[PDB]
Backbone:
């Protein structure tokens, strides 16, 4: 029947209203919030679902409700707390983290969202050296893409916040103290050479100014296990590089530390895209390692499990509510029972199996 | 060094430094006068957190053992 | 074969076994009682009672497989159906209520009706008589007619596609274009029929 | 990973106990140990007594 | 079984015994398959189940 | 056609023994092995030396008992002992066999440096398995 | 008498390589390293060359012990394929049978 179809949608578009009663219900994300809060960071297959269905709907779930609870009760005076979303493949860690990014975005926090951190430790076709420190390298294209997305998300706060120091980009170009933070971002996009340095200034400025009570800051890093792992980038000597040597990885490692206050850090682990990790590794120590685990502790691990019986039925009815499950036997009880066995209640496998059907 | 050791020793480790740094920032935000190192690491909250980290490092990491670590963090960080 | 000729092909129809005894024709009823004292072949790894298993689609997958790469061939077929479902959803959403009714969004029904549209009734077998190669009109069986439709599709996509396009994108665009009776595969079918009409008079030169 | 001082000094203490090469020796120089640890081909009973 | 058998066809082979008798979600199986490849190991389990 | 170790058909007048009648593919099926040592077992040494010693021991016994051997000899090695079991026709006088046994044993013990014993079973005439 | 003149020449190669095995070991050890001066290594490179050519153990060929056949030999029995088949097909090899499977 369609009894869970009533439970397959909720009218509370605002993430603050959501509570345990709303569990297993899909809340539509406003169109403006997609083109502002989420220009990046949504999984690639989910983005396909948003294009075909014509609407983004994120199931409310207990893991993401627990996280939103901690964020509401945040003690800004105390140091920032790192929340680590760890789970098996396809369980929804990225979309559980995106739910928190929507909650903070609506409360006027400053979103610092790193959609994927593995992209910065592999498949880099331009790797320059850094003037600030010659030992480090600069990834111009990777930094340039992030800045364009960071600008879109935080465009409102780019005029209020103002630099507290002077930054000399070139002999002929420098940033005077007091100028809006938008100038630092604008220079990075205009001059790709400085892009990897504009990012460092942005991270440094926001980290320092957040403690002044001007704004809240959400450091949302998905794929955080990339920072303290290994790379597949080679130097001019054809010798593999280390994560610290990269400028982008070096700056970000500071933001995920609890040495500041005035915001919250939300981290996610992803074996997908990871370098030199097993296919069946999902636990925090397996992916982070000894260096990554020690770097982030004390952190709060939030397990993202597979769909429970209530959530699986809600997900099944959502696909049926959009006419996605076009196979004649899918709507039947034997179809549903079959898909429950093949998918095994895994969110990703259910999406993949239903895509072909 | 710490890397050489086969059995984790929380005393004088990266964990103790990271924990002590957090507790020092937590007491400073409270506006209390700077506290002693032994005072911060003698509390029961820190005692339990030591036991959980050691279990993860030596006994083994699993969803059950990670759940115990989650509760210790909540008590240590005064989270609801 | 490692199966002696006394072995019987397995019947994997779930409803057939659970039907009431009276609902079964006595011919079918006889076979069940006979099969109780006979040997049955083990079911193949690709033979299941799943409600989503389509024999035609399973066959099309095997005709695309290369070197025993079934995972890749099944992936290409799964991606194709998805590529066709996503292409019809776009058109359905971007169409008026009147147009929306006609648009079909079931990929399994677009695949079967596409193949059927590419099946040739008659064929041409190439023969040599009098020192030249004279082909002659032939009537095609149900098995040869079905094979030809699938083979012509898997050959148009494999070869006559741009270098950077992928099979899930060329096959989807051909199943849908054939489903409307306008694709190149349909032209291949027209040519085979058209050639037979030209040679209809000279059907005599067949000995098989 | 690199070998710290504790790691390296333990390896030398082990090699000293187990009678293994204790210094850092190139692969080329390890053939001298093989030559003098293995019976040469010409000294094996199969070679010199191949024929009746 | 979703972890051990990442391939869809291998999981379907484990579904065939239960799905046939409409007994899905009514039994708990513990398997121990050693030897062969991915497809041969799923088939060995199917007969054992 | 295979010509190896096959006593080919005549016209029903050739008397073949049990050993001669059976072709190589019946080895280990209908007829056993004439020599039994441990040198061809898995992970065992000195196969080459045992095989060469057998070849000589077969040529030596033929020459030492010329025309007096009804069938191929059977060689049995246990520990360092060698045992030669031969079916011998009753052509020679009895005392001549005692000489050839004492001679052939002593000579073969000082040549291979092992204890060698000769076991002789005398038959009235060659045993015929079938006429081929 | 050995089977042929080729088996005799090989026998001498095997008896002179046994005589010069220690010598060619000690001298060649001085060259198979990177710890000694290259001047000494170049000089040992000439002492080894000066030894008689039949001392070199790479000039030994494994030949059938009974027919002196150069190729086709089986090292466990030291017999050519042709001679080994005669003994095997007759039940004269202990444990060797035809392979049917
Ligand atoms: N809360 C949710 N709402 C809607 N769909 C969801 C939700 N959680 C999971 N899914 C489905 O599961 C798919 C995979 O989710 P997601 O990529 O977020 O998981 P993940 O654990 O981060 O994956 P990976 O380990 O590959 O990084 C999504 O594309 C979507 O189809
Ligand atoms: Mg993810
Ligand atoms: Mg040679």
Residues:
């Amino acid at each position: 029947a369609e009894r869970p179809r009533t439970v397959s949608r909720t009218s509370d578009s605002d993430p603050a209203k959501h509570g345990e009663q709303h569990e297993g219900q899909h809340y539509s994300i406003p169109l403006q919030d997609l083109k502002t809060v989420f220009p990046h960071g949504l999984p690639p297959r989910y983005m396909m679902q948003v294009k075909t269905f014509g609407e983004a709907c994120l199931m409310v779930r207990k893991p993401a409700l627990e996280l939103l609870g901690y964020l509401k009760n945040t003690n800004f005076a105390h140091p920032a707390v790192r929340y680590l979303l760890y789970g098996e493949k396809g369980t929804g860690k990225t979309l559980s983290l995106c739910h928190a990014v929507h909650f903070c975005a609506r409360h006027d926090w400053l979103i610092l969202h790193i959609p994927d951190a593995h992209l910065w430790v592999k498949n880099c076709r331009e790797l320059l050296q850094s003037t600030h420190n010659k030992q480090r390298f600069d990834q111009p294209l990777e930094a340039s893409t992030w800045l364009k997305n960071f600008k879109t998300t935080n465009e409102r706060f780019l005029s209020q916040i103002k630099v507290q120091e002077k930054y000399v980009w070139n002999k002929r170009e420098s940033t005077e103290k007091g100028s809006p933070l938008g100038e630092v971002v604008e220079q990075g996009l205009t001059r790709v050479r400085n892009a990897t340095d504009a990012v460092g200034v942005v991270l440094k400025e926001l980290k320092a100014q957040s403690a002044l009570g001007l704004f809240h800051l959400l450091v949302a890093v998905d794929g955080v296990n990339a920072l303290w792992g290994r790379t597949t980038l080679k130097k001019e000597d054809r010798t593999l590089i280390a994560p610290e040597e990269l400028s982008l990885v070096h700056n970000l490692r500071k933001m995920v530390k609890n040495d500041w206050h005035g915001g919250a850090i939300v981290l996610s682990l992803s074996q997908t895209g990871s370098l030199f990790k097993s296919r069946t590794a999902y636990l925090p120590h397996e992916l982070l390692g000894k260096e990554g685990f020690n770097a982030l502790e004390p952190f709060l691990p939030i397990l993202i499990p597979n769909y429970n019986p209530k959530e699986f039925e809600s997900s099944f009815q959502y696909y049926l509510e959009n006419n996605w499950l076009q196979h004649e036997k899918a709507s039947t009880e034997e179809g549903r029972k079959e898909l429950r066995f093949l998918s095994n209640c895994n969110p990703e496998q259910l999406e993949r199996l239903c895509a072909s059907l | 060094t710490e890397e050489d050791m086969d059995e984790y020793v929380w005393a004088k480790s990266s964990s103790e430094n990271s924990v002590l740094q957090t507790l020092l920032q937590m007491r400073a935000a409270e506006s209390s006068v700077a506290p002693s190192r032994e005072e911060l690491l003698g509390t029961k909250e820190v005692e339990d957190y030591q036991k959980c980290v050691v279990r993860l490092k030596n006994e083994g990491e699993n969803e059950a053992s990670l759940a115990q670590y989650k509760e210790s963090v909540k008590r240590l960080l005064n989270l609801a | 074969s490692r199966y002696a000729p006394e072995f019987r092909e397995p019947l994997i129809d779930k409803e057939y076994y659970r039907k009431p005894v009276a609902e079964l024709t006595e011919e079918e009823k006889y076979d069940q009682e006979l099969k109780k004292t006979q040997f049955i072949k083990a079911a193949a790894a690709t033979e299941t009672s799943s409600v989503f298993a389509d024999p035609v689609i399973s066959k099309f997958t095997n005709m695309m497989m290369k070197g025993g790469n079934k995972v890749l061939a099944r992936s290409l077929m799964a991606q194709t159906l998805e590529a066709v479902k996503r292409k019809q959803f776009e058109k359905y959403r971007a169409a008026s209520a009147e147009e929306q009714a006609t648009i079909e969004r079931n990929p399994y029904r677009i695949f079967h009706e596409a193949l059927k549209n590419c099946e040739p009734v008659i064929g041409l077998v190439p023969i040599l008589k009098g020192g030249h190669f004279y082909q002659v009109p032939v009537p095609l069986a149900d098995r040869r007619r079905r094979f030809l439709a699938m083979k012509w599709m898997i050959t148009e996509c494999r070869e006559n596609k741009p270098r950077r396009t992928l099979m899930p994108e060329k096959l989807s665009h051909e199943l849908l274009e054939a489903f409307h009776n306008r694709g190149p595969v349909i032209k291949r079918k027209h040519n085979m029929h058209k050639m037979a009409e030209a040679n209809r008079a000279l059907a005599h030169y067949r000995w098989w | 990973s690199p070998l710290s001082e504790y790691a390296l000094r333990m390896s030398r203490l082990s090699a000293r106990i187990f009678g293994e090469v204790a210094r850092s020796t190139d692969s080329k120089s390890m053939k001298v140990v093989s030559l003098f640890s293995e019976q040469p081909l010409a000294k094996k009973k199969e070679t010199y007594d191949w024929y009746p | 079984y979703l972890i051990y058998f990442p391939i869809t066809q291998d999981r379907e082979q484990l579904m065939f015994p239960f799905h046939f008798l409409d007994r899905l979600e009514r039994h708990d199986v513990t398997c121990t398959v050693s030897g062969g490849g991915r497809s041969a190991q799923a088939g060995a389990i199917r007969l054992a189940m | 056609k295979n010509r190896a170790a096959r006593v080919r058909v005549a016209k029903g007048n050739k008397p073949v023994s049990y050993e001669e009648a059976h072709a190589p593919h019946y080895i280990a099926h209908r007829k056993g092995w004439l020599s039994l040592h441990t040198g061809n077992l898995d992970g065992e040494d000195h196969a080459a030396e045992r095989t060469l010693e057998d070849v000589f021991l077969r040529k030596f016994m033929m020459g030492t008992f010329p025309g007096c051997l009804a069938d191929q000899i059977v060689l049995k090695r246990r520990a360092n002992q060698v045992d030669i079991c031969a079916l011998v026709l009753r052509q020679l006088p009895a005392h001549k066999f005692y000489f050839l046994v004492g001679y052939s044993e002593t000579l073969l013990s000082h040549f291979y440096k092992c204890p060698v014993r000769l076991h002789l079973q005398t038959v009235p005439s060659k045993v015929v398995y079938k006429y081929i | 008498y050995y089977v042929d003149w080729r088996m005799l020449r090989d026998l001498k190669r095997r008896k002179m390589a046994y005589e010069y095995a220690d010598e060619r070991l000690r001298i060649n050890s001085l060259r198979k390293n990177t710890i000694l001066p290259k001047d000494l290594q170049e000089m040992a490179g000439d002492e080894i060359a000066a030894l008689p050519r039949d001392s070199c153990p790479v000039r030994i060929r494994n030949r059938c012990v009974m027919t002196s056949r150069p190729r086709g030999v089986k090292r466990r029995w030291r017999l050519s394929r042709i001679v080994f088949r005669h003994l095997a097909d007759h039940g004269l090899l202990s444990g060797v049978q035809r392979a049917i499977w």
In short: Chain B is about 60% helix and 0% strand.
